[PDB]
Design a protein around this ligand. Structure first.
Ligand SMILES: Nc1nc2c(ncn2[C@@H]2O[C@H](COP(=O)(O)OP(=O)(O)OP(=O)(O)O)[C@@H](O)[C@H]2O)c(=O)[nH]1
Ligand SMILES: Nc1ncnc2c1ncn2[C@@H]1O[C@H](COP(=O)(O)OP(=O)(O)CP(=O)(O)O)[C@@H](O)[C@H]1O
Ligand SMILES: Nc1nc2c(ncn2[C@@H]2O[C@H](COP(=O)(O)OP(=O)(O)O)[C@@H](O)[C@H]2O)c(=O)[nH]1
Ligand SMILES: [Ca+2]
Ligand SMILES: [Ca+2]
Ligand SMILES: [Ca+2]
Ligand SMILES: [Mg+2]
Ligand SMILES: [Mg+2]
Ligand SMILES: [Mg+2]
Lengths: 437, 54, 423, 341
């Protein structure tokens, strides 16, 4: 067993992390007070769930997580929430004033003053680890802390933990819920400085989650609570292999090996099905073939794009519930004859499949209905570069006029870092086009 | 359609299906950049105070 | 605990500032004696942004009242909410400023500014994390204009990393007290261009036309004008006073509204404006909110382009229908929004509506059409300055004609800067 | 009111469509780089499909199918027909073609060539590509490969149907409109682009009688406009000719094969280009070009992704584009034959 440390940065990361750990506890049978009746090894052990939970002599299971935000209002909700007892104060780090949606303010001005403290609180959790695998970093692209401070943290983690893996869960900005005009700036700035320090990053576009909530859950105006409960389901399906017995994606290193043959192209596309509304008594349970076929519908992807007009480098299928390999292969065979699925020539045309018999757990009283079987597809397709194109275009529109640039220069950032970051994205879009067209 | 490396356990199983075969900066360098940014802030603030002093 | 320090200076500044505290005090359930009597916890969740909590659970506005004459401030202390202000925060002289920017900025005002800063420092010291300052004042007088901009310059020197926000009332010959108002306004605007991050341009001409044309008030008074300002100030500060995601503090507001440092002069708007029991639909709020007749700066938005826009809807309404109508406005009139700032229109919704209204909407626009306001002031300035008329009032206080020439040039530069982004 | 943008100024078809949309009083044209549009008349090259369908509150429609280039390119079409089981290598309405690079099919092309040579069968082939105005028609294989030094070599139809009087060659242009629901609409009006020179099967060097291009006939042909105005014969005259001469109709002898060919090509790529469940919608106007041999068998020549219309038909067709493709998605306040499938 090897431990994994979760780091939640900014409002988006903290609120998403709070939703995930709530779901983790429900899946592992951990109660709000940290007690786990099914755990018979009191005060220790090297079970699969221990990769995310440590144990005290009193039997409390404490998440291996750190919450960081430059403003206390969001983390204070964790201090007084339903799962307040899970965490101890050393895990929650808050400042006095935030980064004001300013990457430079979160990275340089405020980041320089709090970075050493965060590393210290992380070093404490690492000291509890007998064989630390690495870190899962949750954050937004558009926020000043999620973008600015995260990149500084990722840089320092590569220094203090050179051999550890680092995976991201990143929130792509969507105007329908976005709160700042400069989020394209912060997105491209944080992606530039973080690119070399992240081994695998799962981008979630709020636009996609927003419409999935409106269309499949019948939410007229989805809130962050609606969005985060759905996101935590996706994240749970991705991390389930680290927390349960199995043989696929059993450690962080395997994520890169199975999904990232090219290091810079490390943004796998996530597709989840089925998303059923709990406001209907009965719904016809979807088969393995129907939920697997849904993994190739753009309407179910975490990022709206068209994989038909790209190429696959890898594809994993993560099933949860009543699923046997026989039905998976039969479903895949049918889908190949009907779907446009092109792989790169230097890659094998195949699917790595993982099945966990325990069906998905749903938050009691939430919006998602319990289902007999669900699947999350992790496919590394060049089509996800469409999200980079949209982001780079908006960047170009504002930066051509130098709009809002003075806010960043005023924090000590040089104007050259803008073009330097934009040129890196230009090479990134070029890599995707070379690989997929 | 080849099915390989089937692993079964009490809580599930995993396998692979092949449809077709194929055809950092140092801790010192980071500190300098953070300090360089802080120096540009101090310089800009000193200019403001100088301007206000006039 | 992101505290704001409020300052009101001069006759206009104190009369409008007093109405502002009367209005928001009612919204937060605070009575004249500072006692809370509300039925919602939202009233108190962010009460500390504008109020200090004293002994006995009293809430004391974090406000400083400044004036070179005692008259107007005596009326405030004797007003409806006069007792709610901290007595030590009344800082005033006896000479007055005679509607003279030089007196407020260089002579009479300089003698009193240090005592004001002492009170500001006392308030700031007891702030967990000071956001910044908001100043209410007019630009056509002497105290609010001349001494107000002097205070701003010295507040920036002592708090250079804090946000400065002002509600600045622009003079108009239609609602004028003296002929030198264009002089005082021109000298002040350059101070604002340099030393504020956000300025709501409240045009007395617009306030008059709205009271006369729309509200059907034949003989508008200053009190009538201040009714519109109170409602607008309450609207533009809703995101600061109640829980929310968008523009929740002064610095994030500036980041969303100011793409270029000098272009930070906003056109506020309010809806509805009824001359009154009829229910208002979300489509009606949106169209009225964007209608120039609801603008407070007397500028035609269709004569320029919107750099950024902040919209705040108050009351229990269809949030889905709000997004639809907001998207409808931008999609139908997209030509008036600069295309090089994607998604420059941000919308916020607050459940608590203003007093006497089921729902309302406040508009905050950074439009290049605001140059029409500065051109108007610039024309009135030159008409007199070309003959050096009325300058002796200012040279008598030590000022030189060169300082007027430089203020004139600075104003014309600001107009040219707006013009380059309008093409 | 609906909004649209124009990003291809050289499109005569959509220049007319834009002119029609404005005249309805219900459509407004924005700047070409304004993202808040309902409809995009996109550019021919590098149309940014990835930026469509990300505008809240706007149903967005584009006039091009992403991925339809596979059908509208010389080499792409050949590869698509040979490799797609729906069309298959045994396809009977597409001339025997081979992809030749200056993978490659040089050795397979020569293998079939030699078979025809020994069998005394006609061995005339044509080499062309997507970079033409330039073509070469030769009976010796060695001449074809030397000329190329991406191109496609396909069997030149040595026995075309010849219109009389004139003993001349022609090709049939069909306009097909596919809407957002993937309904295939065939414009009832076609055009025969005829050659004004008598077909001379002796010397293929004089291309004035072998190439039916409107431009070639208007510059290199001595009899341009002699038999029909602009070397363009419409279906009414052509149908009457088939009745008076061949004792048949255009519908039975030719149009059935054309409709069949249009269905097969478009249905083949439907899974790859359909925008049924996509965040944006697409429609597209296609230009199918056919050849008819003396046996009254129809052969597909190529498919145009950005075709131009005939002068006499711009009004009717462009108005049809608005009714079927645009108004169906954005209703306001049949000249097509629906090919069911
Ligand atoms: N899915 C999801 N997105 C969120 C959530 N909270 C904020 N966001 C998104 O994050 C972006 C803003 O960044 P934040 O995380 O809120 O800002 P921050 O990281 O706290 O940094 P600051 O500027 O200092 O406040 C916007 O695009 C929001 O839509 C959340 O709870 N769930
Ligand atoms: N295999 C073949 N057999 C007989 N004739 C052929 C032929 N291929 C081409 N032609 C003749 O050559 C002409 C030009 O062919 P092609 O369509 O490839 O060129 P093009 O793409 O430049 C014109 P367009 O874009 O309008 O179709 C055709 O109209 C046809 O008359
Ligand atoms: N809206 C409004 N404007 C005022 C009020 N009082 C004065 N003004 C305007 O302010 C200018 C006069 O400035 P004033 O505040 O009286 O001078 P000061 O006391 O020296 O700062 C003129 O343009 C007046 O029109 C008021 O109560 N409301
Ligand atoms: Ca244990
Ligand atoms: Ca590394
Ligand atoms: Ca004195
Ligand atoms: Mg924050
Ligand atoms: Mg006065
Ligand atoms: Mg062609």
């Amino acid at each position: 067993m090897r431990e994994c440390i979760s780091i939640h940065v900014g409002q988006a990361g903290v609120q998403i992390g709070n939703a995930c750990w709530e779901l983790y506890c429900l899946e592992h049978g951990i109660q709000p007070d940290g007690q786990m009746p099914s755990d018979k090894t009191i005060g220790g052990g090297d079970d699969s769930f221990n990769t995310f939970f440590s144990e005290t002599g009193a039997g409390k299971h404490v998440p291996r997580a750190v919450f960081v935000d430059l403003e206390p209002t969001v983390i204070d909700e964790v201090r007084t929430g339903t799962y307040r007892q899970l965490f101890h104060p050393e895990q929650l780090i808050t400042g006095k004033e935030d980064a004001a949606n300013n990457y430079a303010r979160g990275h340089y001005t405020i980041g320089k003053e709090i970075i050493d403290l965060v590393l210290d609180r992380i070093r404490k959790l690492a000291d509890q680890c007998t064989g630390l695998q690495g870190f899962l970093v949750f954050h937004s692209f558009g926020g000043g802390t999620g973008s600015g401070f995260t990149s500084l943290l990722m840089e320092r983690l590569s220094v203090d933990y050179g051999k550890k893996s680092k995976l991201e869960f990143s929130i792509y900005p969507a105007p329908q819920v976005s709160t700042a005009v400069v989020e394209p700036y912060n997105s491209i700035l944080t992606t530039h400085t973080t690119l070399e320090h992240s081994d695998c990053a799962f981008m979630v576009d709020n636009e996609a989650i927003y419409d999935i909530c409106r269309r499949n859950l019948d939410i007229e105006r989805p809130t962050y609570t609606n969005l985060n409960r759905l996101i935590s389901q996706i994240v749970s399906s991705i991390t389930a292999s680290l927390r349960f017995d199995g043989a696929l994606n059993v450690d962080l290193t395997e994520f890169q090996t199975n999904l990232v043959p090219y290091p810079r192209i490390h943004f796998p596309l996530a597709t989840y099905a089925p998303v059923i509304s709990a406001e209907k008594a009965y719904h016809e349970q979807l088969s393995v073939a129907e939920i697997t076929n849904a993994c190739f519908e753009p309407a179910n992807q975490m990022v709206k794009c068209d994989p038909r007009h790209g190429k696959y480098m890898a594809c994993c299928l993560l099933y949860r519930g009543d699923v046997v390999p026989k039905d998976v292969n039969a479903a895949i065979a049918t889908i190949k004859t009907k779907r446009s699925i092109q792989f790169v020539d230097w890659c094998p045309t195949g699917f790595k499949v993982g099945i966990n018999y325990q069906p998905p757990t749903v938050v009691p009283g939430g919006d998602l209905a319990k289902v007999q079987r669900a699947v999350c597809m992790l496919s590394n397709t060049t089509a996800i570069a469409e999200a980079w194109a949209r982001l780079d275009h908006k960047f170009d529109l504002m930066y051509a006029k130098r709009a809002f640039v003075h806010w960043y220069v005023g924090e000590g950032m040089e104007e050259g870092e803008f073009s330097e970051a934009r040129e890196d994205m230009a090479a990134l879009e070029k890599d995707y086009e070379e690989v997929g067209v | 359609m080849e099915v390989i490396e089937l692993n079964k356990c009490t809580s599930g199983q995993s396998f692979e299906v092949i449809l077709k075969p194929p055809s950092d900066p140092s801790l010192e360098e980071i500190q300098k950049k953070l300090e360089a940014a802080e120096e540009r802030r101090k310089y800009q603030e000193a200019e403001l105070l100088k301007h206000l002093a006039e | 605990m992101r505290e704001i320090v409020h300052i009101q200076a001069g006759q206009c500044g104190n009369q409008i500032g007093a109405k502002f505290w009367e209005v928001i005090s009612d919204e937060h359930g605070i009575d004249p004696t500072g006692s809370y009597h509300g039925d919602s916890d939202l009233q108190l969740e962010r009460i500390n942004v504008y109020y200090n909590e004293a002994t006995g659970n009293k809430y004391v506005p974090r406000a400083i009242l400044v004036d070179l004459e005692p008259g107007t401030m005596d009326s405030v202390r004797s007003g409806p909410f006069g007792q709610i202000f901290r007595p030590d925060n009344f800082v005033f002289g006896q000479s007055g400023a005679g509607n003279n920017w030089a007196k407020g900025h260089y002579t009479e005002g300089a003698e009193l500014v240090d005592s004001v800063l002492d009170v500001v420092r006392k308030e700031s010291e007891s702030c967990d994390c000071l956001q910044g300052f908001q100043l209410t004042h007019s630009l056509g007088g002497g105290t609010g204009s001349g001494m107000g901009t002097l205070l701003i310059s010295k507040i920036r020197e002592e708090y250079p990393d804090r946000i400065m926000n002002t509600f600045s009332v622009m003079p108009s010959p239609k609602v004028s007290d003296t002929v030198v108002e264009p002089y005082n306004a021109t000298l002040s605007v350059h101070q604002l261009v340099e030393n504020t991050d956000e300025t709501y341009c409240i045009d007395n001409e617009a306030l008059y036309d709205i009271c006369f044309r729309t509200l059907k008030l034949t003989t508008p008074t200053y009190g009538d004008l201040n009714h519109l300002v109170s409602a607008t100030m309450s609207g533009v500060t809703t995101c600061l006073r109640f829980p929310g995601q968008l523009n929740a503090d002064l610095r994030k507001l500036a980041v969303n509204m100011v793409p270029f440092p000098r272009l930070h002069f906003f056109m506020p708007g309010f809806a509805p404006l009824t001359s009154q029991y009829r229910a208002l639909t979300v489509p009606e709020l949106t169209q009225q909110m964007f209608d120039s007749k609801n603008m407070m700066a007397a500028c035609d938005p269709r004569h320029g382009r919107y750099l950024t826009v902040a919209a705040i809807f108050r009351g229990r309404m269809s949030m889905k229908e709000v997004d639809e109508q907001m998207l409808n406005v931008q999609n139908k009139n997209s030509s008036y929004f600069v295309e090089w700032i994607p998604n420059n229109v941000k919308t916020a919704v607050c459940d608590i509506p203003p007093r006497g209204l089921k729902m309302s909407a406040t508009f905050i626009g950074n439009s290049t059409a605001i140059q029409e306001l500065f051109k108007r002031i610039s024309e009135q300035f030159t008409a007199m300055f070309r003959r050096k008329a009325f300058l002796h009032w200012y040279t008598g206080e030590g000022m030189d004609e060169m300082e007027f020439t430089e203020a004139e040039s600075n104003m014309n530069d600001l107009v040219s800067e707006y013009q380059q982004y309008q093409d | 009111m609906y909004t649209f943008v124009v990003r291809d100024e050289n499109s005569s078809v959509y220049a007319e469509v834009s002119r029609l949309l404005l005249a309805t009083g219900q459509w407004k044209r924005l700047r070409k780089d304004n993202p808040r549009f309902n409809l995009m008349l996109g550019e021919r090259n590098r149309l940014p499909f990835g930026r469509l369908g990300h505008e809240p509150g706007l149903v967005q429609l584009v006039n091009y199918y992403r991925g339809a280039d596979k059908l509208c390119r010389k080499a792409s079409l050949v590869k698509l027909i040979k490799t797609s089981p729906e069309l298959s290598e045994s396809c009977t309405w597409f001339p025997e073609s081979y992809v030749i690079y200056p993978t490659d099919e040089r050795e397979v092309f020569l293998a079939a060539y030699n078979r025809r040579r020994e069998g005394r069968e006609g061995n005339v082939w044509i080499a062309k590509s997507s970079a033409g105005a330039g073509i070469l028609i030769s009976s010796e294989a060695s001449e074809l490969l030397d000329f190329i030094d991406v191109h496609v070599i396909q069997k030149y139809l040595e026995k075309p149907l010849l219109l009389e009087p004139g003993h001349r060659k022609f090709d049939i242009r069909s306009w097909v409109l596919v809407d957002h629901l993937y309904n295939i609409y065939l414009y009832r009006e076609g055009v025969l682009r005829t050659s004004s020179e008598p077909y001379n099967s002796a010397n293929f060097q004089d291309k004035t009688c072998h190439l039916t291009n409107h431009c070639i006939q208007k510059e290199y042909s001595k009899n341009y406009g002699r038999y029909e105005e602009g070397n363009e014969m419409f279906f009414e005259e052509f149908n009457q000719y088939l009745m008076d001469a061949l004792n048949t109709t255009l519908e039975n002898s030719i149009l059935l094969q054309i409709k069949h060919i249009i269905r097969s090509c478009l249905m083949c790529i439907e899974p790859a280009i359909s925008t049924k469940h996509l965040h944006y919608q697409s429609f597209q106007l296609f230009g199918f070009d056919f050849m008819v041999d003396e046996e009254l068998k129809v052969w597909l020549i190529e498919v145009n992704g950005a075709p131009a219309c005939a002068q006499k038909l711009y009004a009717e067709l462009c108005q049809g584009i608005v009714d079927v493709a645009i108004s169906s998605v954005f209703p306001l306040a049949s000249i097509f034959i629906k090919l069911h499938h």
